[PDB]
Amino acid sequence: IALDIEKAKVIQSSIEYTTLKNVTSATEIYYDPDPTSTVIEEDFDTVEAYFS
Amino acid sequence: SFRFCLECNNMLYPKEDKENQRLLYSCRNCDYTELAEDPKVYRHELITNIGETAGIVDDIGQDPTLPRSDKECPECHSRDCVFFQSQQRRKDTNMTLFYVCLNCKKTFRDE
Amino acid sequence: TMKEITHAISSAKEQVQEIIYKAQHNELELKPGMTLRESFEGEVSRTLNDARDSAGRSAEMNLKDLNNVKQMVSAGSKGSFINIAQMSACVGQQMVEGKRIAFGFADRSLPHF
Ligand SMILES: [Zn+2]
Ligand SMILES: [Zn+2]
Numbered sequence A: 001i002a003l004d005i006e007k008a009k010v011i012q013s014s015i016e017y018t019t020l021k022n023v024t025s026a027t028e029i030y031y032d033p034d035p036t037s038t039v040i041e042e043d044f045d046t047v048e049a050y051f052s
Numbered sequence B: 001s002f003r004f005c006l007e008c009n010n011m012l013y014p015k016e017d018k019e020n021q022r023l024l025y026s027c028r029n030c031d032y033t034e035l036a037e038d039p040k041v042y043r044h045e046l047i048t049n050i051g052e053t054a055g056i057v058d059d060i061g062q063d064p065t066l067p068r069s070d071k072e073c074p075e076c077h078s079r080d081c082v083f084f085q086s087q088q089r090r091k092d093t094n095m096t097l098f099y100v101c102l103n104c105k106k107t108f109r110d111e
Numbered sequence C: 001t002m003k004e005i006t007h008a009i010s011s012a013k014e015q016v017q018e019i020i021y022k023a024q025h026n027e028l029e030l031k032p033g034m035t036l037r038e039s040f041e042g043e044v045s046r047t048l049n050d051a052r053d054s055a056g057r058s059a060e061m062n063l064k065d066l067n068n069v070k071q072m073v074s075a076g077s078k079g080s081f082i083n084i085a086q087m088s089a090c091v092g093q094q095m096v097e098g099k100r101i102a103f104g105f106a107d108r109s110l111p112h113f
Helices: A005-015 A044-051 C002-023 C036-062 C068-075 C081-088
Strands: A026-030 B013-016 B023-026 B033-035 B040-045 B081-084 B098-101
Touching (some): C068 C081
Antiparallel strands (some): B013 B023
């Protein structure tokens, strides 16, 4: 690992601390009274694909 | 953005009906209740870019301490302009320039 | 030698101008563990330090053996290379708290800029 850069980078990634807040960009709260469907149109396709 | 009560000017907190399954903005100081238009109750930006270009005034061309360039205006193609960096002053802030024309007074970049 | 020193300082200032343009067009490489502003400041400071060292080295190579400052520096009794550089070629960059002169006014160092 000391003479190889890729394995060293793998070890570095495995050591460094990473929280959810680091990768998160924005969080939102929405009102949706239908458990099996949704009001948002952008995500409607993906969630209906999941449920089906 | 949050709305205010139309009768006693207090804040309209969101409320949910168990029987009707609707989102309603209701004032806790009275019985007033108005139907909500959007379900976006709350939004938090961990990384934000607001205030970077929001610090702009319409009289910034009268400041004598600002540098003057000859960059081309995208709208009226003037030959004089005034530039400055980002008004946000965090440690992560970029060093990109904002140019202001002396005729239309709009803010535009160089990219 | 004065022509050579002036050429070195002018070339360094042109290099600093190029670094400024690159940082103002998002074309600057970020040193790991440091922000864009910190990397830009460090790179400009390194360029200016190299400029002063090059000008001083030119000035110190110019000196004859009969030069008295050279004789004192070569004896090791008083003075060093930086003294010759600052006396003859260039004083260099002034650092306050390990950084260049800050913007004590509103976004400038003096009301003459
Ligand atoms: Zn009310
Ligand atoms: Zn214009």
